[PDB]
Ligand SMILES: Nc1ncnc2c1ncn2[C@@H]1O[C@H](COP(=O)(O)OP(=O)(O)OP(O)(O)=S)[C@@H](O)[C@H]1O
């Protein structure tokens with residue numbers, strides 16, 4: 001749980017840095033949340049601190065401080081293939097979209113829908129697509 | 133040659149006989165004056181639209197149709213007068229231009245206005261209905277608004293037999309430029325011409341090149357789509373087509389070259405081809421701006437930063453005169469903003485282009 005605790009402490013300290021009116025979240029806040037987790041573990045009578053105690057400590061600290069479409073997915077899929085190229089092969093994009101769990105009919109529908117928006121132009125042979 | 137034929141057909145002045153792309157609007161206009169021509173009563177209409185929508189061509193085609201109908205003794209004969217606002221040295225002189233068009237008499241502006249008023253207010257001899265066209269209306273403005281008032285008030289008189297069509301670019305003109313009584317006179321009679329859709333542009337281009345197979349459909353579609361995404365104007369579309377033909381004389385690549393050469397800005401390449409000392413000066417300006425955060429800096433701090441940069445680069449020590457000469461040369465091409473005519477060491481300098489463009493030009 002140490003990595004998760006460090007991530008949560010980082011998030012809380014970033015939030016306290018963004019807000020000028022928040023209390024200075026120095027090492028003492030991490031010590032306090034560790035003490036809260038250990039106290040919760042003692043309360044539940046367990047020799048090992050679980051993630052529920054950490055979550056409850058985070059919840060308590062947050063309450064205390066508070067008192068003061070297929071078209072888009074297919075567009076992203078074909079955007080992933082814009083690594084330095086203006087034109088993209090039809091077969092590669094179709095295979096990558098099918099591998100993501102979309103039928104070719106939805107691929108064609110998304111292609112047409114984003115073609116309406118003047119984003120790109122598809123060759124009449126349906127072999128290459130040139131991105132405007 | 134086929135390319136020569138395409139160039140000839142795509143010229144701007146090559147007006148077509150009639151394109152139904154605006155037919156609806158045409159029909160509407162084709163009714164209004166027609167009624168005003170059948171009841172022997174004058175009228176006024178205001179048409180506002182962005183340039184390149186074919187307003188002048190539409191009006192001229194309607195006038196041609198009306199003249200042809202009159203020659204076929206279906207409409208009573210009428211006298212047509214056309215005036216352009218921006219083709220006049222002075223506003224009041226329009227009174228002469230109209231008068232000499234209807235009687236050929238030469239008179240002063242005040243006397244011409246008086247005679248026009250007398251002719252349009254007094255029951256004179258029965259004349260043919262007068263069709264007056266005024267172009268570029270907003271350029272006839274005056275602090276007293278007398279000319280515009282008279283122009284839009286005279287057809288109100290029954291004896292005038294006057295029909296006036298006012299072509300302009302701004303639709304706000306009758307509200308924030310025109311006063312109250314004249315605003316209601318043109319009120320409820322405003323025609324707005326929307327820009328062509330890409331389908332309209334494609335239809336126009338296809339009609340231009342009927343029975344001629346010179347361009348591929350993809351290139352024409354991309355040109356129309358780009359025009360619709362930029363301005364939706366037919367003139368620049370025709371220019372792009374002509375330039376693409378010129379390049380093909382030397383595919384979609386031709387149209388892309390035309391559009392990105394006739395629309396894109398040349399600041400980046402001008403900065404790239406600049407001299408080494410100018411590059412150092414620009415870097416010094418950027419460094420000083422980053423240190424300060426202000427968009428105005430005196431010439432002294434810029435000179436100090438330039439000296440520091442030259443020392444870092446090992447370049448020879450530059451004199452003040454050389455730096456001022458470089459600054460003047462840069463300001464001549466409107467890359468900066470300065471008034472070095474009198475002030476020398478206390479010159480405010482502002483960048484004429486965005487900082488990120490400078491960064492992208494200087495990173496390479
Ligand atoms: N009905 C039409 N269909 C297709 N193209 C047209 C049509 N009418 C005009 N054009 C073309 O579009 C151009 C612009 O027409 P104009 O009437 O001269 O522009 P405008 O709307 O009057 O704006 P300005 O600023 O006065 S030039 C014309 O020169 C023709 O080449």
Ligand SMILES: [Mg+2]
Pocket residue numbers: 187188189
């Ligand atoms: Mg015009």
